[model samples]
Target chain A: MDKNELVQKAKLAEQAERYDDMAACMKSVTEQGAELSNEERNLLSVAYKNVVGARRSSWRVVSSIEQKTGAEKKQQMAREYREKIETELRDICNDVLSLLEKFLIPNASQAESKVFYLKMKGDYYRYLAEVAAGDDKKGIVDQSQQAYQEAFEISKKEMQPTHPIRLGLALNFSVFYYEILNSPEKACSLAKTAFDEAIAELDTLSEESYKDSTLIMQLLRDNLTLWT
Target chain B: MDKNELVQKAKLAEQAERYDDMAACMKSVTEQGAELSNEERNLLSVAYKNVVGARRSSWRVVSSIEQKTEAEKKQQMAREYREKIETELRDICNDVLSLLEKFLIPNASQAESKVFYLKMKGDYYRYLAEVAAGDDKKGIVDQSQQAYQEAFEISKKEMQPTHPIRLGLALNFSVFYYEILNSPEKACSLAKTAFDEAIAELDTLSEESYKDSTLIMQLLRDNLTLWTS
Candidate 1:
């Protein structure tokens, strides 16, 4: 199928809750695009992985309900379903992270690409840790933490200290640390460092040049307030 | 000063080879819009950072020249000015990272937020380790690694396996472990589990819905290759 056609089929399957089908279809589409340019192939690959993630989450929801409500009366099914839904939401995040990891180019050189990968890696682990801890999935949490540590190391090593990619990585890391890890002291420290770095770097620009750039400014201001 | 005036002044500084003044002027201009929304602020932040990076690189070129000839001597002076330019570039990144951190709201649930915070702490230490390793910045890497390990422990206690956010964290951890830490065995194992779990729990209608998303497809293929390779 053409890329567009394949995408449409996947979308339809998603809408109908036939997640597995959607994932299978998208995977095929992406694999087909492997012969294309890096840009084209990568784009297709990302789409396929996303569908796979959605399918995985849906399966989890269904299985969780089956396990919890196996012999329960109809009245209890709703409660089980609600619990399962929440679980599924968390699972969806895991799935996305997996998808992100699948497509990320490990040897990227461009600042933006490097930053994007770091952000994706950082966000993935941050989400994983939060989900595992919340559910008392200690094994999962430990595993996820290990992964995060690795990504963090990569960001620090490969990316130039002054590169924007590094800044992005630092920002995301600080956010995840402060918000999910529950160690305000560490969070505060990291946030402070990230804030200081941003301020120092930002202070080198011309105010007029950024007159039309509000998003970057807002990001800075928001980080600046973390200590308070 | 009005934004236009600031730009004009920076331009003049650039022309006069006043790299420090030019960088400073650009920074002020960018900071003036600090109160704006995320999108707007990023637009300017990116532009300003790019300009500064370019200018700094340029100054380095001038400094790399030998001073044997008169022209080379002039070039060396310009290159010497790079010290100031480099500092400005470094400061800009620091500032941007700092600004972004402030907006890091704990996840909608406090429990989630706490876990996220721990992850960031680990990241900070990793950053330190990198700097120390790369530049032989004495003691920084070890100190940061210690902090990162501590934070990782906390994160280990707070995450939920099924949450999307938690999955994201696991995937990140796994990737880092394998790619950056050079612990392929550990990285692969973690990545495999994280991938399996994520595949099992993702939502179809979520913003990160993988259904037909080009990005998702690419990731899966690459990951598959990486796992095997």
Candidate 2:
């Protein structure tokens, strides 16, 4: 099948919330060694993230159980189970990064698309860091920060401050500082800057992007409020 | 501690999102053989539900794994783990029900409070039915329906359609119909009536209740859209 047709089918699968099928459609397009459109890249990103979301959730639960003071045998089993989930999580996150690094980012034709792919790259690295151990965790976290920082800097130069993509870059980048890097002050200032700057020129934002732009700004504002 | 002090502490715990602390505070009050105020009743209900929520979430994940076809030994372990979660869920649900049954509803001094306790009764039974099997599942579902039905009937007669408790009762009852009973049409009809009836009286709704009432009505409307779609 042609890339265009597969991308369209992937779009349909996304709406139906059938992410496995969406991923399959997008994967077929990728397997043909084609440069993907922004839509195709985003659909694959959404599909892969959702497909791995449940494993992340399960790992969180099992990891909590493992960390608790409990019967030694039970906690040992939980450790092994959590390890199983983390293994699967690592595989999925790495596959997503491979696609992004090789196909998505390199093929990006626009600033928005480039920032979006970079942000997604950061997101998957963050996911990998979530269950990784010690030195491995630090390496993944550093990679995540690098991706997010690059995306943020590019957005500042190329995209409008109120653009949803730019605002989203700020939001996720701030979240990385807050959560992954444990830099609460850095998170607060980044979020505060994004929210204040967006609100100042809210009227200049395109009507089509108004909803998403404002929503991300609101999240940024909320994080600032909660953190401060 | 005195019931009043414990209830106050429960309030503080609730604000902190420390539900286990809230539940402990409220449980101490309950053990003292005191009839709780409406605030105390609500505090205890919120505390217990939140405390049990993580177990329910974990059970859902484990149960999903157990149901999937996999290596026999691996699946057996998942089954046992899920069963562990379910057992804890059942104990908490039953404990909440016992409190509601023996104390909360009986001491309700107002129409809204009675409906609130009864609605909570329905909720815990619904939780039990979620993980139950065979005849036990049917029995729990029947109890849930009965509690919700009684609560809805009372709210209709005793409270305005736009009252938050009434609107919330309708919302959860309709969800029960849609999910537990597998009656989508029944759910749509119930939710439609509650939403339409409330919007008709939207002008008369109290200013304080406007937020909760409208929010629940929006949920009811959203469900109607998706289920009908």
Candidate 3:
């Protein structure tokens, strides 16, 4: 398009808030006008940059508005955001858990791994809900507790006396109960199970995995004592 | 502006994703169409609704994209979104916590009440992190833990054993450890403390408050077992 046409189109785009298009139109006009007067080029350049700046500023304002709202506002936004995100996450969990659950029912050789995966998926959601709640209300905790309980049930059924996955599940269960749900006795018991299982699993692992296992156990212990 | 001009502007707005302005332009055209032909009015109405529908659809798509994207996308988006939300929540928490912390310190006669407020403020941030992290990573848990620990420290120093605030703090702490953090042994101890202290304070409460306290305790116990499998 000619300079005038390009400028008009850019203006229209700007008015319409089609910022990306406005920027493109402006850039094209600037590029096409290489033989134009210096004054014209300078003016076009300033205008093009202004439109780009405005677009960035608009995004900034929108982001700020989303964040600066109160707890109620954030919660409302979160609820809206969660409808889609939660469903997606749950679907992933379900797909993975279904496989694990099938193995658990048959009491297969891979039951330990299946149970571990199930517990890990549960922890994943628990972590999500906990993160979502972000110290606002009990909603996230409530949601997490529900998911953790579901996972914990599978863990109880699938847990082998010698399985490290069992220990991980126990640790997760205890941590959620004590940390988010506020059940000290349950937390203590779960912590003990987690530590004992970690110790039991310690000798089974190579030096590398043992360190990882020990680290997890130690973190759990520290977490347990943080409240106590 | 004329009806045709307004319609053109509105259409342009929709194309550019300027939803709010598009809606406004459409509304104005429809509202001020005293001299418009019947066809013009009809067209304006359709255009207005279309813009609104498009805007809603666009936002829905954005939301869906946020969920369906892989972990990496979520993480990248989170890094961008977190700073926006964190600053506000932190400001609010800091403001409220400062007030409650003051009351908890120096042994206020009503230490329990102050501690309860402090704990709630702490819970607010912890809860925020939990919700924000929704299926992303362990970042929220770590963040909440930090906030919870801060609140707990304030309680340890300033609150009386039988303070109602202490009971609330204990209850929340127990719940956090038990359910969110998943520490059952700690959950049990915190529950015991909460229950006992709550009972002691029961005589001091109105009947309604007493019932609420009992209900909270029952819920806490129920949650404990539920987490334990």
Candidate 4:
């Protein structure tokens, strides 16, 4: 099928909350080697996250003893589904990472493609951190931070200092620090830096220079206030 | 049903494109005299519009002579549906107008409530203009413009100069002029004034005063560009 037809199938699946089918349809679209647009990329992200979200809900239902299973049966089933959550994440991140890297031309907005991949990797790594315990948790978190570092470095160099994409990347990375790594200080510090720079960008720039970016900067500030 | 339950039913009906059911659900909630919050009010407006929109679709399908009826018969039925559109608008607007007026306290944020009602009135009036013909067309357009005028005047008095609600109201009203009334001159003019003021607000204000209006400013500038171009 063509892009529009394939996307419609994905959308119908999503509306039905058949997220596994939704993700499969989106994968079909990508595997055909069609270049993805921004809408497709965002929807791919939403669809895959939803696949995991559905599994998470199922696990929660079992954990709450809402199902027919009891005690050992529930515990066994919930553990299995909990493991599947990471399995879902890895498949999702891998699919897009390959798709994005295949088109990664390594400069300018291709840097954007690379950044998108790195961010996906970051999310997967954070999920790893969540699932891991003890020494493994530290290791998983280190990998997550490393993925964020690569994205941050590339985004800063590939675009302006206060690029909205860069700011957004940093914001999510900080959430990993705050939520997963038990490092609220680092998260707050990073958010503060981005917040100040966003304000400065607004102060110095005109509507003509920034085009649509002022809008994103404004959004960044709103999000930053919540983070700090 | 309870208000929330009724609203949820309406929203689900809306999503299913069962807009007649959606409108009925909303009407049932309102006839219970359940006061609507902002979220409910917005969805109620959308539901009523969709109710009319579904009727309009029936009219279009019939006008194309593509349905079960014969060509002339189809046109006859569609013409009847077309005339029924304005009745839908009046019933909806009058109901909501009285509902809002009952709660209208005529104060700071309460003043904003009146502005919101006036904007909805403008929308229904424009729907009237869409279906009306001949001398009726001019009068419907005049009422539409009048609703917009009161909305604008009240919004300015009750809101910060750069309020999101006010700016959005003007942006939409400008579209009415451009699209329905075929007055590009007025559309461009209102759009320009609003566009310039949005930028000025961005330039002078900081985080506290402007809050999160940059998106709207960027949007207004985009619309202004299209209007001028």
Among the numbered candidates, top DockQ falls to 2
- Model 1: lDDT of residue A221: 47
lDDT of 3 by residue, B81-186 (tens): 3343344444544443443344332333444433444455556545444445466326656655665566677766875444444555667777778657768888
Candidate 2 stretches with Cα past 4 Å from truth are A1-228, B31-35
lDDT of 2 by residue, B1-229 (tens): 7666677656645654557767988987876766677577778878998878867776776667667755775566567656766887899898888877787778778888889988999999999998888778989998999999999989999998899999999999998998898999999999999999998984777778789888999999999999977
**What's candidate 1's DockQ score?**
0.01
TM-scores of chain B, in order: 0.43, 0.94, 0.45, 0.71
- Stretches > 4 Å off in candidate 4: A1-228, B11-18, B54-109, B203-219
Q: Which residue pairs in candidate 2 collide?
A: none
Candidate 2 is scored at a TM of: 0.52
Fnat for each model = 0.00, 0.00, 0.00, 0.00
The C-alpha lDDT values of all candidates are 0.49, 0.81, 0.52, 0.65
Q: For each candidate, what's the DockQ? A: 0.01, 0.03, 0.01, 0.02
Error of 2 at A209 (Å): 33
Error of 2 at A222 (Å): 18
What lDDT tens digits, residue by residue, belong to model 3 across residues A76-195?
543443343334444433433343344322333355444544454455445445434446336645655665565566666765333445556667778778756679888887777667
**Candidate 2 backbone overlaps, count:** 0
Which candidate ranks first by lDDT, i.e. highest?
2
iRMSD values, candidates in order: 29.3, 15.1, 16.3, 13.1
lDDT of 1 by residue, A120-211 (tens): 55555555555353566555445545554555566566543344445545555666656666566665576556546545665554455444
Q: In model 3, what lDDT does residue A226 have?
A: 78
Candidate 3 error regions (>4 Å): A1-228, B1-68, B71-75, B101-109, B121-166, B179-182, B196-208
